[PDB]
């Protein structure tokens, strides 16, 4: 169930890599802008954009990210459990920490976690350092998260019975 | 063939239906290996027969080890009967 794009997002860009396409008349340049769009409350989205100009590609990536968001269970501004994202040779670990450690992660991971509404997290990249694969792995790890209430419902158990 | 096997079974039989006990199989393996060796004394170039003989000897040794780990008196008696040393 996709959520609507009507939210107070930040649309903070990450980077812009220049692209080249060869033609009989030499090379042809394109600007591929990858942007992460999200709100500071459990809403985040990754997007990509290609165009002959930087701002046009930025707008394309913003719209693309808006067209695909995802929720995250920010249990006390921290993840409920540790998980690993392994999307396309991108290994990124995520650990919950105390309420003062802060956002300890790489550039793109840090931006994603900031636009995701998460305060204190422990992370480490154990694979490729490519921003796109890292973002995909982080999003995969976020989607694979579990909530206490849903597990309690599925297990025919109570939350206090689970953790008490 | 099919006649020496019967005699070996009868000699090494423990019961009327005994046909797979370690002693009988070991005696059969010994007889077959002896025949194969006698054959090899002439056809030195038949290496496939040598490989078959090696497999038979490995089976015989594993069976001897199992017997020794199970029963020592029976193992010694079988060695004495076959003189396998």
């Amino acid at each position: 169930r996709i959520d609507p794009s009507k939210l107070e997002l930040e649309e903070r860009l990450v980077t812009v890599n220049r692209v080249a396409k060869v033609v009989k008349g030499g090379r042809r340049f394109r600007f591929a802008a990858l942007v992460v769009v999200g709100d500071k409350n459990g809403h985040v989205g990754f997007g990509t954009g290609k165009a002959q100009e930087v701002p046009e590609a930025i707008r394309k990536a913003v719209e693309d990210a808006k067209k695909n968001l995802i929720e995250v269970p920010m249990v006390g501004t921290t993840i409920p459990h540790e998980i690993i994202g392994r999307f396309g040779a991108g290994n990124i670990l995520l650990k919950p920490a105390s309420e003062g450690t802060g956002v300890i992660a790489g550039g793109p991971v840090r931006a994603v976690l900031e636009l995701a509404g998460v305060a204190d997290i422990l992370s480490k990249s154990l694979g490729s350092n490519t921003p796109i694969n890292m973002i995909r792995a982080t999003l995969q790890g976020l989607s694979e998260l579990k909530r206490a209430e849903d597990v309690a419902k599925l297990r025919g158990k109570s939350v206090e019975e689970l953790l008490g | 063939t099919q006649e020496r096997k019967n005699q070996l079974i009868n000699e090494f039989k423990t019961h009327e239906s005994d046909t797979g006990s370690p002693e009988v199989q070991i005696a059969i393996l010994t007889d077959s290996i002896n025949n194969l060796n006698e054959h090899l004394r002439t056809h030195k170039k038949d290496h496939h027969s040598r490989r078959g003989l090696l497999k038979m000897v490995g089976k015989r040794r594993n069976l001897l080890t199992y017997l020794r780990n199970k029963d020592v008196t029976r193992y010694r008696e079988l060695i004495n009967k076959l003189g396998l040393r």
């Binding site: 459990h81 540790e82 919950p96 579990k146 597990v151 419902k153 599925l154 025919g156 158990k157 689970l162 | -």
Partner: protein, 131 residues
């Protein structure tokens, strides 16, 4: 051969989960019976039945799906393998996903989970995890 029954059972359950099957047949074994009963009483399995035969006996498990399509069991993993044994003390009993999951442990007073272990402050063979 197969080097162990437990890893086989766990990986068969994992495969059944991946293909989204509803039944499973396993060569029954005392330890397998205890593990299946534990998984059942915990809510991972909707129900389990046993069959005492002349060969090995068969323990049949029924995978649980509490919604349209959602695997109550997401992944399995063994710890103590036949060649690398893992033993955890009462002070080092490992929690699974901050207690969200569960782990099985063999002790002297019976097969206990993480919660029962903490309750009895027991320890011993840490064999596998359950998510």
């Amino acid at each position: 051969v197969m080097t162990d029954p437990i890893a086989d059972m766990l990986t068969r359950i994992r495969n059944a989960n991946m293909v989204r099957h509803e039944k499973l047949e396993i060569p029954a074994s005392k330890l397998k019976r205890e593990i299946a009963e534990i998984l059942k009483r915990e809510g991972f399995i909707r129900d389990v039945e046993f069959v005492e035969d002349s060969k090995q006996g068969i323990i049949r498990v029924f995978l649980k799906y509490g919604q349209n399509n959602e695997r109550v069991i997401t992944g399995l993993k063994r710890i103590s393998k036949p060649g690398l044994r893992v033993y955890a003390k009462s002070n080092e009993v490992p929690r699974v996903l901050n207690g969200l999951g569960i782990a099985i442990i063999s002790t002297s007073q019976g097969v206990l989970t993480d919660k029962e272990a903490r309750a009895k402050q027991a320890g011993g063979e840490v064999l596998a995890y359950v998510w």
